[PDB]
Design a protein around this motif. Structure first.
Motif, short mmCIF file in Angstrom:
data_model
loop_
_atom_site.label_atom_id
_atom_site.label_comp_id
_atom_site.label_asym_id
_atom_site.label_seq_id
_atom_site.Cartn_x
_atom_site.Cartn_y
_atom_site.Cartn_z
N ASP A 55 -1.20 -66.55 -19.57
CA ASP A 55 -2.27 -65.80 -19.21
C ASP A 55 -2.35 -65.06 -17.99
N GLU A 56 -2.03 -65.82 -16.72
CA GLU A 56 -2.21 -65.07 -15.46
C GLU A 56 -1.03 -64.31 -15.25
N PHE A 57 0.22 -64.78 -15.74
CA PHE A 57 1.28 -63.88 -15.69
C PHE A 57 1.21 -62.42 -16.48
N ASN A 114 14.03 -70.75 -12.91
CA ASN A 114 12.77 -71.63 -12.11
C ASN A 114 11.58 -71.35 -13.24
N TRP A 115 10.59 -72.19 -12.76
CA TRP A 115 9.32 -72.34 -13.74
C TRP A 115 8.71 -70.93 -14.03
N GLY A 116 8.75 -70.06 -13.02
CA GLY A 116 8.31 -68.66 -13.05
C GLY A 116 9.18 -67.88 -14.35
N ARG A 117 10.24 -67.79 -14.30
CA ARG A 117 10.98 -67.25 -15.32
C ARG A 117 10.90 -68.06 -16.66
N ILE A 118 10.71 -69.13 -16.78
CA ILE A 118 10.47 -69.96 -17.91
C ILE A 118 9.28 -69.40 -18.45
N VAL A 119 8.07 -69.33 -17.85
CA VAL A 119 6.79 -68.65 -18.18
C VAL A 119 6.93 -67.24 -18.61
N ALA A 120 7.76 -66.60 -17.80
CA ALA A 120 8.01 -65.10 -18.34
C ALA A 120 8.62 -65.13 -19.68
N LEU A 145 2.79 -79.04 -10.31
CA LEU A 145 3.03 -77.52 -9.57
C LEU A 145 2.18 -76.64 -9.78
N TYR A 146 2.18 -76.40 -11.04
CA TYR A 146 1.17 -75.13 -11.62
C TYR A 146 0.20 -75.37 -12.47
N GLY A 147 -0.39 -76.42 -12.66
CA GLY A 147 -1.54 -76.62 -13.39
C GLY A 147 -2.66 -77.20 -12.36
C1 LIG Z 1 9.59 -63.73 -13.30
C2 LIG Z 1 9.00 -63.61 -12.32
C3 LIG Z 1 8.67 -64.96 -11.41
C4 LIG Z 1 7.92 -64.67 -10.59
C5 LIG Z 1 7.58 -66.00 -9.64
O1 LIG Z 1 6.63 -66.05 -8.63
N1 LIG Z 1 8.17 -67.38 -10.08
S1 LIG Z 1 7.86 -68.86 -9.20
O2 LIG Z 1 7.73 -68.46 -7.78
O3 LIG Z 1 8.64 -69.90 -9.64
C6 LIG Z 1 6.26 -68.84 -9.84
C7 LIG Z 1 5.12 -68.44 -8.98
C8 LIG Z 1 3.77 -68.78 -9.60
C9 LIG Z 1 3.55 -69.49 -10.69
N2 LIG Z 1 2.14 -69.61 -11.20
C10 LIG Z 1 1.04 -69.18 -10.16
C11 LIG Z 1 -0.11 -69.73 -11.08
C12 LIG Z 1 -1.15 -70.56 -10.23
N3 LIG Z 1 -2.48 -70.77 -10.62
C13 LIG Z 1 -2.56 -72.17 -10.98
C14 LIG Z 1 -3.34 -70.26 -9.71
C15 LIG Z 1 1.02 -67.61 -10.57
S2 LIG Z 1 1.12 -66.91 -12.06
C16 LIG Z 1 2.72 -66.57 -12.39
C17 LIG Z 1 3.51 -65.80 -11.56
C18 LIG Z 1 4.75 -65.58 -11.77
C19 LIG Z 1 5.30 -66.20 -12.85
C20 LIG Z 1 4.72 -67.06 -13.60
C21 LIG Z 1 3.29 -67.32 -13.59
C22 LIG Z 1 4.48 -69.96 -11.21
N4 LIG Z 1 4.36 -70.38 -12.54
O4 LIG Z 1 3.33 -70.82 -13.13
O5 LIG Z 1 5.51 -70.89 -13.27
C23 LIG Z 1 5.94 -69.75 -10.93
C24 LIG Z 1 7.50 -63.61 -9.70
C25 LIG Z 1 7.78 -62.52 -10.64
C26 LIG Z 1 8.64 -62.53 -11.92
C27 LIG Z 1 8.96 -61.16 -12.47
C28 LIG Z 1 8.17 -60.65 -12.95
C29 LIG Z 1 8.48 -59.50 -13.86
C30 LIG Z 1 9.90 -59.19 -13.85
C31 LIG Z 1 10.82 -60.10 -13.13
C32 LIG Z 1 11.94 -59.99 -12.97
C33 LIG Z 1 12.97 -58.94 -13.48
C34 LIG Z 1 14.18 -59.56 -13.97
C35 LIG Z 1 13.98 -59.52 -15.48
O6 LIG Z 1 14.72 -58.37 -16.26
C36 LIG Z 1 13.73 -58.04 -17.12
C37 LIG Z 1 13.09 -56.92 -16.45
C38 LIG Z 1 12.01 -56.18 -17.29
C39 LIG Z 1 11.51 -56.85 -18.77
C40 LIG Z 1 12.29 -57.82 -19.01
C41 LIG Z 1 12.32 -58.42 -20.29
C42 LIG Z 1 13.00 -59.42 -20.84
C43 LIG Z 1 13.80 -60.05 -20.12
C44 LIG Z 1 14.20 -59.46 -18.59
C45 LIG Z 1 13.43 -58.35 -18.22
C46 LIG Z 1 12.33 -60.97 -12.21
C47 LIG Z 1 13.87 -61.47 -11.68
O7 LIG Z 1 14.26 -60.85 -10.83
O8 LIG Z 1 14.00 -62.79 -12.27
N5 LIG Z 1 11.30 -61.69 -11.89
N6 LIG Z 1 10.15 -61.11 -12.50
#
Ligand SMILES: Cc1cc(C(=O)NS(=O)(=O)c2ccc(N[C@H](CCN(C)C)CSc3ccccc3)c([N+](=O)[O-])c2)ccc1-c1cccc2c(CCCOc3cccc4ccccc34)c(C(=O)O)nn12
Ligand SMILES: Cc1cc(C(=O)NS(=O)(=O)c2ccc(N[C@H](CCN(C)C)CSc3ccccc3)c([N+](=O)[O-])c2)ccc1-c1cccc2c(CCCOc3cccc4ccccc34)c(C(=O)O)nn12
Lengths: 141, 141
Positions: free
Chosen positions: A40-42, A81-87, B139-141
């Protein structure tokens, strides 16, 4: 912890969240809940930036897994990483929502067209000969 | 009085009535209402007698209009009347409801399988290496 279970939960959550249905529908819970919330946040933070790419992408009867896999590999090119897993889950949920929408519209439009065709060729002459739809109302309202 | 408009109305009503949804969704009116109501009563009276045939018939990307037409022609072999017209609308609505149900299940379960496959091949090893899903929650919950 079962990955298939996560997938299924996340997808039903997203479908439901977007108002989709085609039927009248603790530690494991905690993971699901955090994944839902992170998805949801993502989506709130990135849907604009993701949107330019996830616009036309709509899976059809013929789409191959390998195409899906080649596209997804891009997300994980610099590693996992977890972020990318969420994506990944969010991408999946958006794909699924988009495909369902299109496929359902295509299916229902085809059947509507079939019915309209059948009405026009086989039934409209009789309807006109027997008082039109106003007579139907009169008789069976 | 537009026959296509009736079809579209009847199908939307039946889909909604059965809890189908994708998306967040006087002269003419009276005919629609009477058709909806007659279709409802027809279904209450005859759904059991229909049910045998209602169940397995489900249209796919390749079903030909001609098959539909050949099947529907049977309903009208002895001629056209209002009752048979209502039966036609209800038949179409049941086809539509049944096809949407099946096609949606197939579509969503295919995407679920794709995601589960991708998780298992490319992501599960990392997940296990980096603390499992419990670490994600911490970490993220
Ligand atoms: C994936 C990503 C990760 C982070 C990150 O910040 N990752 S993190 O630091 O691990 C982390 C931090 C915070 C949290 N959560 C907190 C929640 C806290 N709340 C409890 C308060 C914030 S919500 C949150 C926030 C971030 C992530 C999760 C949740 C978590 N989490 O929850 O997992 C993890 C930041 C940015 C991006 C990102 C976004 C968009 C595009 C893109 C690319 C382009 C390449 C892809 O090509 C394509 C391009 C375009 C389209 C495509 C389509 C399909 C395939 C490939 C495509 C790359 C890259 O270059 O790979 N990255 N992106
Ligand atoms: C079609 C029909 C009509 C009537 C009828 O009664 N017709 S009626 O007198 O005109 C009339 C009366 C009352 C109302 N409405 C009132 C509403 C009053 N309320 C205001 C209170 C009652 S609700 C109501 C009631 C009835 C109808 C509508 C609404 C209305 N109406 O509204 O239109 C009209 C009665 C029974 C049946 C019927 C039912 C089930 C099967 C079947 C068949 C087998 C097909 C075999 O072919 C195939 C063979 C093999 C395979 C096939 C596959 C697919 C198709 C066909 C196949 C045949 C056939 O062989 O024909 N017929 N049936």
């Amino acid at each position: 912890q079962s990955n298939r279970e996560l997938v299924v939960d996340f997808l039903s959550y997203k479908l439901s969240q977007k108002g989709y249905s085609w039927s009248q529908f603790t530690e494991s819970e905690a993971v699901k809940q955090a994944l839902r919330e992170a998805g949801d946040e993502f989506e709130l933070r990135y849907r604009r930036a993701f949107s330019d790419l996830t616009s036309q992408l709509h899976i059809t009867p013929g789409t191959a897994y390998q195409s899906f896999e080649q596209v997804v590999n891009e997300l994980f090119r610099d590693g996992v990483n977890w972020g990318r897993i969420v994506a990944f889950f969010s991408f999946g949920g958006a794909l699924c929502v988009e495909s369902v929408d299109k496929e359902m519209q295509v299916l229902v439009s085809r059947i509507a067209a079939w019915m309209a065709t059948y009405l026009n060729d086989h039934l409209e002459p009789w309807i006109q000969e027997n008082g039109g739809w106003d007579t139907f109302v009169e008789l069976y309202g």
